[PDB]
Amino acid sequence: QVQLQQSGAELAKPGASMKMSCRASGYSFTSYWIHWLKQRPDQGLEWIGYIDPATAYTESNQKFKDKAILTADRSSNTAFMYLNSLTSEDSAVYYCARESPRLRRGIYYYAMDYWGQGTTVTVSSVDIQMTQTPSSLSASLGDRVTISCRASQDISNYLNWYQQKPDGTVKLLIYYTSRLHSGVPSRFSGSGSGTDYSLTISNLEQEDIATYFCQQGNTLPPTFGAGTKLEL
Secondary structure, eight states: OOEEEEOOOEEEOTTOOEEEEEEEESSOGGGSOEEEEEEOTTSOEEEEEEEOTTTOOEEEOGGGTTTEEEEEETTTTEEEEEEOSOOGGGOEEEEEEEEOOOSBTTBOOOOEEEEOOOEEEEEOOOOOOEEEEOSEEEOOTTOOEEEEEEESSOOTTOEEEEEEOTTSOEEEEEETTTEEOTTOOTTEEEEEETTEEEEEEOSOOGGGOEEEEEEEOSSSSOEEOOOEEEEO
């Protein structure tokens, strides 16, 4: 079983540097990319970059190009991220996540199929826009519910959906508009095309209470929606 284990919470001084790690077990580390992401209090996620462990090649978001450096060591099955010139804007939860198996030779989904548990950092002494509606939505057990997602440009069906629980745990539910991931119960379904997409949950259960994110992976950098909170 795939597993990603991240390092423990740290505090730091303004102006300093720091280093955090992500240890892999239960699969061939050199066969899939590792991604890094940032999430601020009560906000959506931002994508920082990825590294290919087999070749050491890296890709970075222009917004983080002076802020972060990514590395990997194959023998110890571990990836790393280094940050510099820390400010209060840098206090956040940081995550690592694995890239899913490809679509065909040279064509990836940009769907993150397994996630680490997050590291909390405290500092103390044109992009494609996604729009999710509504921002929160209440329902009762056994109901049918649908949520909507729009992008600012044709994303040609490269649209993915994730679920985040109150304790931070993140998982992939659907990739490439309508494909279920391993272990997802078939009461989850999705549809769309062009710029307009939706997710539908049939026969709600109490373990479905959470926050839901959409994400395009047509063009770099990957961008996320701001979330829909689903409550009883």
